[PDB]
Design a protein around this motif. Structure first.
Motif, mmCIF file in Angstrom:
data_model
loop_
_atom_site.group_PDB
_atom_site.id
_atom_site.type_symbol
_atom_site.label_atom_id
_atom_site.label_comp_id
_atom_site.label_asym_id
_atom_site.label_seq_id
_atom_site.Cartn_x
_atom_site.Cartn_y
_atom_site.Cartn_z
ATOM 1 N N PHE A 26 1.471 23.037 9.104
ATOM 2 C CA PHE A 26 0.071 23.446 9.169
ATOM 3 C C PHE A 26 -0.103 24.831 8.537
ATOM 4 O O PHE A 26 -0.972 25.611 8.940
ATOM 5 C CB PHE A 26 -0.433 23.458 10.618
ATOM 6 N N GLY A 27 0.752 25.129 7.556
ATOM 7 C CA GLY A 27 0.756 26.412 6.873
ATOM 8 C C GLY A 27 1.437 27.546 7.621
ATOM 9 O O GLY A 27 1.534 28.649 7.094
ATOM 10 N N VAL A 28 1.885 27.313 8.850
ATOM 11 C CA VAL A 28 2.630 28.346 9.552
ATOM 12 C C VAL A 28 4.110 28.251 9.157
ATOM 13 O O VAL A 28 4.696 27.168 9.235
ATOM 14 C CB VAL A 28 2.481 28.220 11.062
ATOM 15 N N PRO A 29 4.706 29.367 8.693
ATOM 16 C CA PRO A 29 6.096 29.371 8.210
ATOM 17 C C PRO A 29 7.058 28.881 9.275
ATOM 18 O O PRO A 29 6.970 29.335 10.423
ATOM 19 C CB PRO A 29 6.351 30.842 7.885
ATOM 20 N N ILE A 83 -3.670 27.780 17.423
ATOM 21 C CA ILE A 83 -4.118 27.229 16.169
ATOM 22 C C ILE A 83 -5.116 26.070 16.388
ATOM 23 O O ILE A 83 -6.106 26.002 15.687
ATOM 24 C CB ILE A 83 -2.888 26.854 15.304
ATOM 25 N N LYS A 136 9.249 23.596 5.016
ATOM 26 C CA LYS A 136 9.121 25.043 4.944
ATOM 27 C C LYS A 136 8.062 25.568 5.922
ATOM 28 O O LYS A 136 8.182 26.680 6.451
ATOM 29 C CB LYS A 136 8.799 25.472 3.504
ATOM 30 N N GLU A 137 7.043 24.756 6.182
ATOM 31 C CA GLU A 137 5.984 25.118 7.121
ATOM 32 C C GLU A 137 5.488 23.915 7.902
ATOM 33 O O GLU A 137 5.789 22.772 7.553
ATOM 34 C CB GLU A 137 4.798 25.764 6.384
#
Lengths: 179, 173
Positions: A38-41, A62, A35-36
């Motif tokens: 490194f937390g980026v969607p 990032i 789904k992501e």
């Protein structure tokens, strides 16, 4: 040393920060159905695959600690490049490889497009102290041109005996001639 | 490169040294602090110090690294053997550097004749130019390779040629 910090764990292997926004890895080490990253969607990340080479362009810088490095397709044939191998047990293990041509190779029980090379440890790269192990995949191939470092792709396969390695590259096309 | 071998590499003078057995410690001669009275608090006069060139072999009067087993130590490696310099850096990195051993040789460094077994790093096109080779501070780190199921130490690091891939491993005379 700042070059080693660009190499981080990723799925079942590793990946490399070419720039603050651009990350490269092997296709067979990516977590599937993610789904992501490194937390980026995932929808906001540009995922380019070609063969076993995988490029990820993030929507914002990032890894802002690093500078952008030159990323070229392969390395010119004959160039002796370096695999920066990182191991889970902490070792930083640089291995020289002599690069050959882009091609489509039968190796590790599959078919792999990429640039072939041969480790200078040659004959006894069957040992992981002196060669590649699966799980080194995603680690970067680099070489020095003048004062510039050039990354040419990442590790993705090797023959059983260790000597032949394959560097997954961005767009690899070899030309040959019937002689 | 198991942990049990890396842990044998410890700081010594301006470089490092290597515990071969609980009582036996090897290093590069030039790296030893001159005019020391003790090593690890053991009075020098109780330690057997044998120097052959840049190779230094110290036998301590009582076991002291009692956690380690005795390792095979040999006088260099057969020429053409591929080994590993186990490099430790003061900032904590472990860098195993692959190398191919050549013949024994001699170079005049700072007016003095320095000798040992030579090798070529297999870490890149030009190791020093890419900072993928050795560096001042690295002397005393061990050259190691695996023969069957035994690890063998063949000597320790002592010098390198500027701007290249060539290294000099000091061996037991």
């Amino acid at each position: 040393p700042s070059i080693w910090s660009r190499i981080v764990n990723f799925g079942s292997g590793w990946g490399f920060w070419v720039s603050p926004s651009l990350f490269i890895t092997s296709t067979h080490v990516i977590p599937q159905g993610a789904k992501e990253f490194f937390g980026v969607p995932i929808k906001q990340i540009q995922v380019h695959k070609s063969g076993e080479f995988c490029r990820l362009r993030f929507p914002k810088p990032i890894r802002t600690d690093v500078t952008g490095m030159i990323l070229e397709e392969g390395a010119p044939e004959g160039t002796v490049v370096t695999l920066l191998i990182k191991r889970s047990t902490g070792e930083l293990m640089p291995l020289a490889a002599r690069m050959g041509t882009h091609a489509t190779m039968k190796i590790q029980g599959r078919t792999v497009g990429g640039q072939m090379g041969m480790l200078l440890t040659g004959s006894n790269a069957k040992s992981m102290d002196l060669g590649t192990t699966p799980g080194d995949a995603g680690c970067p191939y680099i070489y020095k041109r003048g004062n510039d470092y050039v990354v040419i792709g990442v590790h993705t396969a090797a023959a059983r005996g260790g000597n032949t390695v394959i560097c997954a590259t961005q767009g690899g096309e070899g030309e040959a001639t019937l002689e």
